[PDB]
Design a protein around this ligand. Structure first.
Ligand SMILES: Nc1ncnc2c1ncn2[C@@H]1O[C@H](COP(=O)(O)OP(=O)(O)O)[C@@H](O)[C@H]1O
Ligand SMILES: Nc1ncnc2c1ncn2[C@@H]1O[C@H](COP(=O)(O)OP(=O)(O)O)[C@@H](O)[C@H]1O
Ligand SMILES: Cc1cn([C@H]2C[C@H](N=[N+]=[N-])[C@@H](COP(=O)(O)O)O2)c(=O)[nH]c1=O
Ligand SMILES: Cc1cn([C@H]2C[C@H](N=[N+]=[N-])[C@@H](COP(=O)(O)O)O2)c(=O)[nH]c1=O
Ligand SMILES: [Mg+2]
Ligand SMILES: [Mg+2]
Ligand SMILES: [Mg+2]
Lengths: 210, 210
C-alpha cells in the first residue's frame, strides 16, 4: 500500500502557513487524495495547553523547559502520524521541528545543535516548504499579534536560524514566493505537493536529523 | 560568598536514595551547614503531575515525550537551583539526569546519546553518589512497588546504562556500599559530602555533559 507523504509548511511571520495549509488539504482532497491537516503546537493535549498558556503570556516557562515541551508535543503525535502515513494518508503540517529550533534558537545562549536534539528521530518530512516574504510585504498583511515572539527583532533572529537549517541537504526544502496572491501561492504549493506525494513516497519514511 | 555544593544521590532500587538523602540534609544542617533537599521527579509542578500520573500507571505517555518531560522537570528547577547554590546553600538531590537517561535508556531503541541531550547544560553535580546494593539484599528490603519500571528485568537494563554513565570521568562519581545499615551508609555519605562542600566548591558550578 502506497504510503502518504509528510508535507511541512514553515515560513516567516504572516507569510501564510495556516492559510496555505488549509487550502492545500482541501485541494488534495478535492483531487481525490486522502489528506489531513495537522499543526504545531497542537494545543488540545495537556502539553499543548501548557504551550498555549505560555504563548499567550498567561504563564511564563523556563526556556529549556518550554523548548522540550514543544518537542514533546510533536513526539506525542508520532504514533498517529506514522499510522496515518502508513494508511496512505498525506499529512500537511503547519509548522514542525524547524520552528521549534528557530524560535528557541533565536534566544540568547541556545546553540542550534542543542535545540535540534530533542527532535532528532522524528518522522522526516518528504517536503519542507519555506514561505518567504519581505518585511514590507508582511506588514500589508496586518499588525503583529499579541502573543510571545511576535516582535520584529526576535523574528529576524529566528529567520537566521531558519537559514542555517536550510543548509541541511538531507531535507527536501523548497522555497515558496509567498508574496503572490493567496491563489497563486496555493497553486505553487499544490504542484510541489502533488509531486512529493507522487515520487517522494516510493522511499520509506525517514527520520529527521539522523 | 562561598557557593553551596550540588550533591546528587543515584542508586539501584531500594538502595536507600530517599532515606539517605533526608538523613544527609538533616545531619548537614545539624552541623551548621545550610542544606536543603530536592528530588526528581518534582511532582508538584504541572509537568510533575503529568509524570506522577504516568509512573502510577494512571496515564500512558509516548516514550520520547515522557523522556523530555522528565528533563523539562529538571530545567524548570534550574533558576532555583542556581540561586540557592549561589547563596551558599548546599543542595542534596534524590535522583537527577542520571536516572533520566538510565530509565529511558533501558527501553528499546533509545541510544544513550539521544537520552543525554535534553539534559546537556544542566547544573553539574559536584558529587554523584551511586548507592550499590546486590539484588538478594534489595529483596530483604521489601517487594517492588506498583509503579512503572518496578520490574527486575527492566531494573537490570537501567543498571547497565548507569554503568555506562559512570565511565564519564568529567563527573565526580563515588560508589557507596548501600548494603550496610542505614546509619553506616549515612556516615559514609556524610563524610563524602562534607568533603565535597569543603573543596569541590572552590570551582564555579559546572555544566553537565558539556
Ligand atoms: N498570499 C497572501 N496575500 C495576502 N494576504 C495573505 C496571503 N496569505 C495570507 N494572507 C493573510 O495574511 C494574514 C496571515 O495569514 P496566515 O495564513 O494566518 O499566516 P501564518 O500562519 O503564516 O501566520 C491573514 O489575514 C491572511 O488572510
Ligand atoms: N541501608 C539500609 N538497610 C536496610 N533497609 C534500608 C536501608 N536503606 C533503606 N532501607 C529501607 O529500604 C526501603 C527503601 O528505602 P528508600 O530510601 O525508600 O530507597 P530508594 O529511594 O532508593 O528507593 C525502605 O523501607 C527503607 O527503610
Ligand atoms: C511548533 C513550534 C512553534 N513555536 C512558535 C512559533 C510561534 N510564535 N511566534 N511567532 C508560535 C505560534 O504558532 P502559530 O504562529 O503557528 O500560531 O509558537 C515554537 O516556539 N516552537 C515550536 O516547536
Ligand atoms: C528523575 C527521573 C526518574 N525516573 C524514574 C525512576 C523511578 N521509576 N522507577 N524505578 C521513578 C520514580 O522515582 P522514585 O523511585 O525516586 O520515587 O521515575 C525517570 O524515569 N526519569 C527521570 O528523569
Ligand atoms: Mg498560522
Ligand atoms: Mg551530538
Ligand atoms: Mg526513593
Amino acid at each position: 500500500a502506497r504510503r502518504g507523504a509528510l508535507i511541512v509548511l514553515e515560513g516567516v511571520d504572516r507569510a501564510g502557513k495556516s492559510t496555505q495549509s488549509r487550502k492545500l488539504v482541501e485541494a488534495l482532497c478535492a483531487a481525490g487524495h486522502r489528506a489531513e491537516l495537522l499543526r504545531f503546537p497542537e494545543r488540545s493535549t495537556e502539553i499543548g495547553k501548557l504551550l498555549s498558556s505560555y504563548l499567550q503570556k498567561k504563564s511564563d516557562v523556563e526556556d529549556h523547559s518550554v523548548h522540550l515541551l514543544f518537542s514533546a508535543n510533536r513526539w506525542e503525535q508520532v504514533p498517529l502520524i506514522k499510522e496515518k502515513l502508513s494508511q496512505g494518508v498525506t499529512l500537511v503540517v503547519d509548522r514542525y521541528a524547524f520552528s521549534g529550533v528557530a524560535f528557541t534558537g533565536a534566544k540568547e545562549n541556545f546553540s542550534l545543535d542543542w535545540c535540534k536534539q530533542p527532535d532528532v528521530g522524528l518522522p522526516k518530512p518528504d517536503l519542507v516548504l519555506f514561505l518567504q516574504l519581505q518585511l514590507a510585504d508582511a506588514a500589508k498583511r496586518g499588525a503583529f499579534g499579541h502573543e510571545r515572539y511576535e516582535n520584529g527583532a526576535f523574528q529576524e533572529r529566528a529567520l537566521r536560524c531558519f537559514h542555517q537549517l536550510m543548509k541541511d541537504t538531507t531535507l527536501n526544502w523548497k522555497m515558496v514566493d509567498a508574496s503572490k496572491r493567496i491563489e497563486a501561492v496555493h497553486e505553487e504549493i499544490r504542484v510541489l505537493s502533488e509531486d512529493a506525494i507522487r515520487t517522494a513516497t516510493e522511499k520509506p519514511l525517514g527520520e529527521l536529523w539522523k
